[PDB]
């Protein structure tokens, strides 16, 4: 019922030490926007996972021109301050809905409006921790030879394949997605 090539793919040369469940997204990615706002893929996947399992989510550089790099660093700041849940929706909307995010200054305005003090954003932005998080996200994408988003990898061996699942019903799709990750995490 869970055959290889249908719900998932397998990496030709796995990545040792990868997180158990790794999501790659871009704030420019049309389907990543749905995955956040309409499907809630991350929340629904976490719900089907054993309670002692961490999920990791990384931003990618290769969409959005120069802004893709700035958003990857801003996402690193978000991870460093632990404010992902305060900035995810206004970044998605500013980039894709209203298209009001066109510079690094615009990203910063989102964080300030979300309650992060301007000076603390800047200090995080220029910190060694954020430098290292940026490196981590880029290495993770290179390690799996990531070509596009959204993507989810399980134990650095298995790559989810949403296009082999049933996509005519949003809620059936999300259930098949979350159930496929639980299966794969059990491998
Ligand atoms: C990595 C490739 N990639 C980018 C380029 N690309 C491919 C097709 C369109 N763009 C993806 O987007 C991959 C993809 C993801 C999901 C998915 O299925 C659904 C999406 C939204 C909803 C809703 N709401 C439903 C119900 C299903 C289909 C495909």
UniProtKB/Swiss-Prot annotation:
It comes from the Bacteria. Pfam families: DSBA. Keywords: Disulfide bond, Periplasm, Redox-active center, Signal. GO terms for biological process: cellular response to antibiotic. Its main location: periplasm. InterPro entries: DSBA-like_thioredoxin_dom, DsbA/DsbL, Thiol_disulfide_DsbA, Thioredoxin-like_sf, Thioredoxin_CS, Thioredoxin_domain. The keyword Ligase does not apply. Disruption phenotype: Induction of the PhoP/PhoQ two-component regulatory system, suppressed by 50 uM CuSO(4). Residues 1-130 form the Thioredoxin domain. GO terms for molecular function: protein disulfide isomerase activity; protein-disulfide reductase activity. Belongs to the thioredoxin family. DsbA subfamily. This is Thiol:disulfide interchange protein DsbA. The lineage of its organism: Bacteria, Pseudomonadati, Pseudomonadota, Gammaproteobacteria, Enterobacterales.
